[model samples]
Target chain A: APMKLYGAVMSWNLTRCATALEEAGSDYEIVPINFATAEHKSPEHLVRNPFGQVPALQDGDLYLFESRAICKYAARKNKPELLREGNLEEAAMVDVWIEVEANQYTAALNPILFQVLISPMLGGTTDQKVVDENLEKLKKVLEVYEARLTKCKYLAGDFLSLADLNHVSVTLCLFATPYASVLDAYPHVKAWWSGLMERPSVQKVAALM
Target chain B: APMKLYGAVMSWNLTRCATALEEAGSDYEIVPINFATAEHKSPEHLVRNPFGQVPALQDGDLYLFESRAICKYAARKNKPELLREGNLEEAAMVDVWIEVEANQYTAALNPILFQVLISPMLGGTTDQKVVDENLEKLKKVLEVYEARLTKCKYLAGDFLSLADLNHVSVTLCLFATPYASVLDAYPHVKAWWSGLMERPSVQKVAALM
Candidate 1:
């Protein structure tokens, strides 16, 4: 039997995993967690995920938590045909990108987001130094994207891999912000995003969001 | 050829990819990027990964930049026999955990770490308020872990999946600190961690440090 997925439709992270599932053509069930009502913290939901988060997966007696790991397992399990299961060397490229996304890339974006957007939303002002430091850090990261895109067709390989999916989906949430201007500076990333955006699965997921 | 993994032996992120390689039993080249000298930023290495981070994986012409992505790619590419390729639902659980780690768990651990360790190392003062808040947040997360782990074996399932690897490795960094005392309040978490700590890969990787 296929597993069941639990997440909110509006969460970008949820959409990311859902997009991967759609790409893999996997059959799964969705159990939406109500973030608006704080349902993620509900006792029952807490049993599924101790962290009080969305996009948890259940497979028979097995339950896995971690969106990237779950989407990856789904991609590998159902549609290895579409996903790139290359040699060890190629696969390592995939590993590196995921880490980059979580550590530096996400790290750079998360704090800046709180400083510029979230803190303000909460009626608290952000520290100017925090905002400036993160903005500069993000800019350098963008420059790297620009340079690498100039060299390759995709983030990790020739064909579209999970690496590409991981990246575009990440930046997609903030695409509407001025911080997103970094995209224009990195044309390769823009082009690659456009290409992935054109995919049917990605399009379907985007439409839903 | 196996892809080249560029990072030092000491980095936790790098170790994730290395363990994947060992588990997949994939032969690959190991190219150490010296953190001591910061060779990653040199133009040559930057060509492969703009992030200037370690654990960059390279295949002949293809390159991937994240450790999690690289590790997942390894699970997909090599020894599908060894890795747990869960159903779609199971995979989604993995995503949730990864996100929680990124959003909730890391939110707690990172600040405490920087405030207690890295900041001092960098000649900066600790943000005591930040450290206290993180510890409180982490205690709640561990409580959830304690409850869920009471019935479940692995975070996702009975078998060890990539989600486990991601969660354990990230948490281990916190364990190395005196702040791990925060986990003592949650017994199941301590047991769960002790079990994971016993894995050969986990044991092997820890010994390497």
Candidate 2:
């Protein structure tokens, strides 16, 4: 039987897992948890996820949280091909880039997302100074990405891996905003991003989002 | 032959990878790059790690960066026992907690480390405001951690995993500073941390640091 995933469809983190599952061709069911009702914080939800966060996966008797972790498991389980090529070097490179997406890319993007999207929704002013600084950081990050993409078809190597998939949700959100044009300056990065966006698995997730 | 690890011996990130190697009983040599001379940014180093960061590992012809990823590779290579208990559930839980250490604990702790340690070393004044805010966030994070520790001996479960090892370097640095008492508020966190500190692999790394 397919595993059960708990989280709203709109959650970017949840979307990350869903997209990976799609790529892996894993059979999974998404069970929505209503954010407006504070259902995620209830005792029932907390038992499944101590941190009271979204996108907790139940596979058999096991309960797992953390979208990237879920994606890792799903990829490894259903389609190890999604992880990396056979060589140990490729595997290490894939992991290195995955960590970059997690530690570096998401770190720079999260604040910009908060300032641009969440602040206004909560009736707070967007800090242009934070936005400007982060945009500069994002540009620098993309410059690095551009250089890598110019050498290889994907972050890890010639084929798409979890390293590329991990960035889908965050990059999609970034491109949805006005600052997305910032990606245009880095030709290789933009082309690489366009390729990811055009992938059937990613497009399926985008449609649901 | 053993791999060559490139970074200063004193770097916390290098210590993290080294600790994992110690646990795995992996043979490796540390090849120091003098950061004071900007050697890390040199063309030779940049070829090994495009991001030009420290603690890049080289196995034969393979090059890898990102300390946590290196730790993951080491744990998998020599001592699979340090990963999980050979169960799917345990493996997923380990990944889940590893993400917690990466996305939550490190995120909250990095700023305080910067404000307290890096600022002083660079001839700049410490930002009490940043430190205070991060400490408050750290306290809240530890509360969640305390609850988890109460239920299990380690973050993932009863067994020690890379999830616990990943925190050794950062937590030791934090405890060494005057802000060590911050951990006292959470009894379980303090106890859990103390246990990790006493681990032989961690002790060896601590002696070098």
Candidate 3:
């Protein structure tokens, strides 16, 4: 049986999970959760993800949420090496960078996206103050990314790992905004992000979004 | 040579890393980074961790930061089972809760700790408004924790995993403040937290802090 994912196509996290499946060439099906009808918060959806969030997965009897974890589990199924290369040291780097994306990158970028895109669509005015503050935070973070990328081609190391792939959806969302200049200002980050965006799997997900 | 961890003993993340080392029975040394003197921001320290954060670990030539990742790496050193139970479903649960801690729990709790505890110590006033908002947010998160704890003895499952251990240091810090009542309000969460705090490894690290 093919693995099943529950989320809307436009959800950034669902895109992330789908991209990982594509990268690993895993058989999967998307089961849409309609936000318009509150489908994600329904009793059935809540069972799969207690938090009632998007991008939950069902593999046999196993249920999982937290998109990165779902992606990691899916990667490990067909391509264990993507989760972490065989070396312990490299695996450590992958883990570190993944946390950086979770703790640092997503922290800054998520609010920026919500304020700039989502809030306006809902008829609420964008908080320019919030957008500016988070952009400044993201800029500082990108400077660090620029430094890391100079030393290694990817966030974790020279080779691509789940660490790099996990970033695709949000990075695309980030670059789509005027904050795209943030990437352009940092040559290494821009180059690396461009390369990631160009990947067949990322492009496949990007087209859907 | 013992693995060297650079950070102040009082730093919560150092306690996290230390707890993992003790749990794994790994030989490690803590070399203090004096925050008072701004040592973490020094050029030497920045090379170890670009973010200039506490609890940077160096194992031979491998330098790593991000406390949870460091703890996960340390767990892999001696007893990989401590990181996850080895069952794919169980491991997926671990990853999901770990993200919950990162994305939800820490997102709310960290700011509360900083405003109420750290800010005052640094000769700054506590932001009562910020504290109230975060505490309210934390209450909602604990409600979810309350529900999850009703099903299993631990966050991920009955057995201790990095998912539970990762909460040790921060949970301790949270309870140390008047906010201890937050845990008291939820019976199952309080009981679960009490069991985690009672672990010898956590107790050892708590005593040091």
Candidate 4:
């Protein structure tokens, strides 16, 4: 049986797992927790993820949470090439760049995303101060990304790695916002992101979003 | 010569790298970046970390930034047992818990630590509202940790993994804060944390903090 991913269809974190699964060519099914019924807080879902969050993976007798963690499991199982942990040097490089994305890139971008994309949907007005502050942070972050992308075809190196692929869900949402053009000044970053959009796996996740 | 870790000694993120390096038994030298002169934002340090952050690892000609990523590289190089990626199931379990610490645990605890320990040092008043809110969130997170610790000896399982060790730096800071007593409610989590403090690597880091 395929693994069951319990999450909403549109959750960026869930789609992050989906993108990794798609790239790894893992056959998995998405089992949505109906927010209308508070299904995620139910005992069944709570057992899968102790924090009662969406996008918990149930594989056989085992269950795991954390989207990036779920991505690693699927990638290691089906597409070890994505991780490249076999080669010590390549693995170290992958570790470095993925952490860059996870720690620096996402930290700056997620706040902007939440303020612009999600806040309005939740019947909350956009906090302009939050948006402006994060946009400034995002600009500095993109400058770094632009410089790095100029040196290599991808974040980790010339070879594509999970580091680049993991940015898919966040980019999809950024494009849906008014600030998608924030990439205009950073030519190399825009080029890198454009390449990400061309991938079938990325496209499939975008299709659902 | 040992690897040069460019960072300040007292930084929580930098100490995280130091803790891992100590555990991995890697010979490393701490090269402080002079914050008074804005040395962290200097061109040399900028090359080490494009984001101009501290605690970038320099091994040979390679420069890798991000404290957690630096930890992984050191562990994989010297202390492979700490990672256990050789066994995919255990590896996946480790992945799950480490991300939990990386994202959720630190996410809640950092703000509280910052307001309690850092803000006072910075000559700023502690925001009780921020403390209260994050404390509430942390209580819920620790509840999950307590439950998980009851089932497994550590976060991932009986064998100690990087997941437990990674919490040392943050936990050290938390212990220095008034909120250290927050762990009293969760016996299993406290027991788990108590075990972490017994490690020489953790003790060394705590002494410095």
Best by DockQ: 4
Clashing pairs in 2: none
Q: Tens digits of per-residue lDDT for model 2 on A155-208?
A: 988988999998988888886678889888889988998888878999988887
User: Which prediction has more favorable TM-score, 3 or 4?
Assistant: 4
The lDDT ranking, best first, is: 4, 3, 2, 1
Candidate 3: true contacts recovered, fraction: 0.73
lDDT (10s digit) by residue, model 1, range B63-182? 776676777766677755334443555555555555565567666777787787778777999888998887888787777667667777866556666666766555666777777776
Q: 1 or 4, which is superior by TM-score?
A: 4
Q: Per-residue lDDT tens digits of candidate 1, residues A38-101?
A: 9988987766666667767776776666677677777777876445554665555555555666
The better candidate by DockQ, 3 or 4, is: 4
Task: Please give the distance, in angstroms, between residue A79's alpha carbon in candidate 1 and its true position after superposition.
Answer: 3.3
Worst 10 residues of 1 chain A by lDDT: A81-90
Which tens-of-lDDT digit does each residue in B128-152 have in candidate 3? 9999999999998999999999999
Off by over 4 Å in 3: A124-127, B124-132
| Pairs in steric clash, model 4 | none
True contacts kept of each: 0.73, 0.73, 0.73, 0.85
Candidate RMSDs in Å, in order, are 4.7, 2.5, 2.1, 1.5
Off by over 4 Å in 4: A123-125
Clashes of each: 43, 0, 0, 0
Cα lDDT of model 2 by residue, B96-187, tens digit? 89899877898889898888887888899899999999988788789889999999999989988989898888887787789889888889
RMSD of 1: 4.7
